[PDB]
Design a protein around this nucleic acid. Structure first.
Ligand code: K
Length: 88
RNA sequence: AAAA
């Protein structure tokens, strides 16, 4: 599953990129004030669900990332996550 | 879901 994990990792890192975040008003509305989102919400996005429905592989893919941080069931951008949340 |  190593190649599939790499595709999932890079797809989710795109969502958490600055270039995406500047326009991704839905993602930012769903963040809590600390920048965290449910990993299961990310799992529902079309390009992730195309690759897998195995939540364990999604967690494994993201543990490897230098872009995002996992706390329990939630994920956020590591760099300055508090700048991005928006009102629901 | 214009890579939510
Ligand atoms: K919010």
């Amino acid at each position: 599953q190593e190649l599939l994990k790499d595709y999932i990792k890079r797809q989710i890192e795109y969502y958490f990129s600055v270039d995406n975040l500047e326009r991704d008003f839905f993602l930012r509305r769903k963040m809590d004030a600390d920048g965290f989102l449910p990993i299961t919400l990310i799992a529902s996005f079309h390009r992730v669900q195309a690759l897998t429905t195995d939540i364990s592989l999604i967690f494994a893919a993201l543990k490897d990332s230098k872009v995002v941080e996992i706390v329990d069931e939630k994920v956020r951008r590591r760099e300055e996550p508090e700048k991005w949340p928006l009102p629901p």
